[PDB]
Amino acid sequence: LEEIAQLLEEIAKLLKKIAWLLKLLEEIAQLLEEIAKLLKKIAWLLKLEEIAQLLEEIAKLLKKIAWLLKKIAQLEEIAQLLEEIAKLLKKIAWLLLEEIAKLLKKIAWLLKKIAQLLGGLLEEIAQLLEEIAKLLKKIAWLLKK
């Protein structure tokens, strides 16, 4: 309950940093790995078992994005990976807490927009990530209540 909420607020903090770094692809990749580790902890606490499996799949997808970013420092595939994460978030919302489920679907929508922006604007993506961080912070607030 409260533990999972604290791990969500930590992810939001890491997303806000990523948005600021978008203006150092190597540093963002490291943060995405941290977010994946936090997602693994949330999955462990839940178990329940279905949502945990889906969160683990999202963690691996973020790891793939991180390895893709490290390769760029040394895009279209990242977009497809983000769309997969969105489809997984919507699946988690379908299982869930109606208010929290709606905030997840909204996060999935914004995640789809970021994927679209990757096809073409870096400033817009940073704003989208900050909106997602706010929505995650909101979900954590409902968990503590």
Residue numbers in the entry: 3 to 25, 37 to 60, 75 to 101, 110 to 131, 147 to 170, 184 to 208
Give sentences from the paper.
Here we describe efficient routes starting from validated parallel and antiparallel peptide assemblies to design two families of α-helical barrel proteins with central channels that bind small molecules. Computational designs are seeded by the sequences and structures of defined de novo oligomeric barrel-forming peptides, and adjacent helices are connected by loop building. For targets with antiparallel helices, short loops are sufficient. However, targets with parallel helices require longer connectors; namely, an outer layer of helix–turn–helix–turn–helix motifs that are packed onto the barrels.
Using the experimental apCC-Hex structure as a seed, we designed short loop sequences computationally to connect adjacent helices to generate an up-down α-meander structure. The sequences and structures were named sc-apCC-6-LLIA and sc-apCC-6-SLLA, respectively, for single-chain antiparallel coiled-coil proteins with six central helices. As the peptide assemblies were hyperthermally stable, we heat treated the cell lysate (75 °C for 10 min) and subjected the soluble fraction to immobilized metal affinity chromatography (IMAC) and size exclusion chromatography (SEC) to yield highly pure proteins in a minimal number of steps. Circular dichroism spectroscopy showed that all five proteins were α-helical and hyperthermally stable structures, and AUC confirmed that they were monomers. For the antiparallel α-helical barrel proteins, the seeds, models and experimental structures for sc-apCC-6-LLIA and sc-apCC-8 are very similar. Thus, the success rate for making these single-chain constructs from the seven antiparallel designs test was five soluble proteins (71%) and two new α-helical barrel crystal structures (29%).
